[PDB]
Here is the input.
Amino acid sequence: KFKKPPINNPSDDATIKLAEAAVSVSDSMLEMAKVEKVITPPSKDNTLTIPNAYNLQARASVDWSGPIEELTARIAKAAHFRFRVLGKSPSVPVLISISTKDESLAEILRDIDYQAGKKASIHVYPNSQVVELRYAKIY
Amino acid sequence: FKKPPINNPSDDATIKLAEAAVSVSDSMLEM
Amino acid sequence: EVKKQGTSSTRQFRQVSSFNQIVVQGRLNVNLHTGYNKPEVMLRGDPRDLVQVRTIVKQNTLYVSLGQGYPDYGAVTVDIKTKFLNRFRYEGAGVVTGNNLRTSYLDLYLANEGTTRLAGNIGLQKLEAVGNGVTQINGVSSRNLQIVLKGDPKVLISGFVNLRQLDMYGKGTLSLYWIKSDTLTIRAKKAAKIQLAGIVNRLDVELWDFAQFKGKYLRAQRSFVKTHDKSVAEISAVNHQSSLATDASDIYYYNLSKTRADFMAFNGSVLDMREWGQSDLKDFDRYNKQFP
Amino acid sequence: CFHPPYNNFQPDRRAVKRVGVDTGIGAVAGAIASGTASGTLIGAAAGGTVGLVASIYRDSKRKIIRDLQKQDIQYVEYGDTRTLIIPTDKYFMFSSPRLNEICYPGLNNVIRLLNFYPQSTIYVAGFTDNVGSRSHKRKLSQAQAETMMTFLWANGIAAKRLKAEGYGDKNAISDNAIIHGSAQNRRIEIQWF
Amino acid sequence: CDLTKFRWDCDLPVQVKPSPASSLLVYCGSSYGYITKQQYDILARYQRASVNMVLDINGEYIDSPCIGAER
Amino acid sequence: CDLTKFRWDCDLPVQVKPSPASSLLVYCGSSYGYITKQQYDILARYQRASVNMVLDINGEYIDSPCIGAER
Amino acid sequence: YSLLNEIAAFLKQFRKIAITVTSYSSKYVSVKRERALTLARSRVVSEYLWSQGVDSRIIFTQGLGSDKPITSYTLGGDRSPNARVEITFRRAV
Amino acid sequence: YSLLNEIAAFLKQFRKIAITVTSYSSKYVSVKRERALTLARSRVVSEYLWSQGVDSRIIFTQGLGSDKPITSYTLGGDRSPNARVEITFRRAV
Amino acid sequence: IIYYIQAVIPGRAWLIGSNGSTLTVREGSKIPGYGMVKLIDSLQGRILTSSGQVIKFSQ
Here is the structure.
């Protein structure tokens, strides 16, 4: 008999078209990220504003697609850090969607801060055991 | 007896869709 | 045969031809010195063992052994000033001291509690200890070196060593302070303690039983670590790490290699054992995440 | 008799198990047929011989390759350079170096086939499709190839006989512009002499 | 404290005034006191263990939750 | 090199700086080095034979394809 | 894995927002060894439960080593009563 | 030519853009002799395959003489295992 | 000149140069650019210098 290794389950043309579109989108995203990085490379890491500590090395697998504040509060509670909020929450919510698996709470907070970007910023003070989410001074 | 993931990409096109999503999320994070 | 005790030590001067291998037996003190003087030996001791001591040079080897029996002599000091050294073998529970022994290659073969001290740039390629002897070498530079231990000695080495192979069959203890190796192969069998610090391009460790390999601070680019029943190894791989713990064995990886693959057979364990509090603790990636 | 997760990397014993069962059934049949010690011995000998021939068949290289083809692993022998192609899609957790232990029959068969060549030099090369970044594909293929190499080394293969290298989308045996070809490009190849 | 035994029972004295020796805040509900560095470390260890650490004065419960604050 | 035997296994040292002796470019993927005229000739012979000539540093694969460049 | 499958079915029976998987063990070598072992165990169990998809937005993981035992009978190794894995959650609504 | 006809039918069963016909042979006289012999053999086989029209835009031809053997058993002339003609192609879509 | 650790042991450290110049440092010693060294850390691979900046294993 003659065979080749990857004999997977039958695929649908809906998934096939979605896969082609997703590959094109991924290539465009790659080019865009590369050109922006060349234009202006990053200079500062957010590990300064979110320094890791003990009990921030507890791990979590998150699947979240809601406003930032509830996820940050849950992360802080699981890290046994008091949650503090600065600034006025905007009328348009700072939605985040983090879909990870088995990564530390400090790394999840870093991802949340990066995804928030110019809308919100997460800081961690380990001496005070405080996770602080501040909504930027736009408006 | 261990069972495979329920959401495991086991389709010829689903696997490519999933890696494309992974790459898009990675490039988003880099941006 | 008469007892040496009851007399005071006296100075003696004896002429010795140029030599390269020095085999010493029995209990005594051996001192090695280097200078502008010709090959010379002075034996300080009671004026009764000065004739019972045999100092014979044949075919570039000097035999400092017992002569006409061994009634008693353990307080005799043999200080040899010589510009040529290529080997050293000692047995008989003595005290050996030497410094500034410039060399390109030699061997030390110690046996039975030879308290040995070296304080020079001794570049060697082969080491051997029968057991129960303490070795302290301060300053070694080699492009290859091999240690095989069959007893229970305590040898510690300083300098830079291009260690290649290490074999342990007894309850020995060994330490190296800085090593710059390309391919290290360590095989430990029974209750052997090994400690090595430095860099390694490809390390391959096989511990069999009760063997401890405190390889932390020995950053290996590639690690091939296998531990068998009730053995402990500490590794700090940098690029690629491959580990297998068979049963009741332990592997602790103190560094997060870019790629990691560990396996457990019966009850073996491979743990991270990092601080969790380092301000720069790198987290696992897509290519790092292995779930035990 | 056999632990499903790699049998603790311990030697496997289908031959002895099968011959033991065969002598057991043969001795039982002979005892039933005769009721005598000589008849029981004859039945046990018949069971031993039938188990010997059955295990000689089932331990053959051809049967191992047929079983690997029943699984989703391809075998290619061109000259004296033998290649096993193992799909990452089935033998690896999605986009991760984690080996798929649910497919342990295939991994055990790969190890058993590689055991037939104690002197061969094995190269394990990893490949991914065109999706993702260049660095991502390089790193992922390297990690998958390294995991397979570590599995080979743990199951009783010397560390000197193994080399693991990871190419990205560089060397393709199919067209990445189509779905099935892109899937065929996601593979690990084990080459030995 | 004794942290393992079975019931992890232990005692942490509290100093209300911020002494140079004990200047690390602890918020026992709405009532806050000050303790030392070792006391804060072991309280944080108990918090990681997720153990209630109610404030008692003269054997009388006053406030339930204890959370470390600025050092 | 040994080009026939069975596995055509061989080794080519690479000098990063363009020395007068070794000034012929080789593009090992994205990493480029310099080699000599005889080395370039035998590399081109292997390229004609269509043999992968991956770059290895300390026994570690770095970059797959080798293609000759300007002399 | 059959036991883990039954536990995954149980977790799938409820709707929840966050599960927590915690690991405790008897003291064997050192506090660091126990902590690392327990964190690895929690990671592995959480990974399997996550793969056997449960209706859980977050699955927190932690190992405290030998910090909070539930029984004064500490004799034994993994057979000891206070060497365990706790999966705790709250039913959502 | 019956074998070449079967191979031509096999090639016709697929759609492709470029085939490659390569020749290797054992060392007989000199490197130039082997190279010329292998190139001529590839030329002739490619000519016959082209005449028995296959759906192939290009049919590359080459002979490396004795450059890439596939066996350590070099004993023999044309009976040597590594004295062969390789027809390699890729199915187009 | 930038410095990275090649290996470190409790008591002394071994550093490599920007171009590959080896160097060995005791607990208190001197290196160019960084001045005086006052603390080497073993479990965490960092050495503190009087210049106010830390040198760590290169990535």
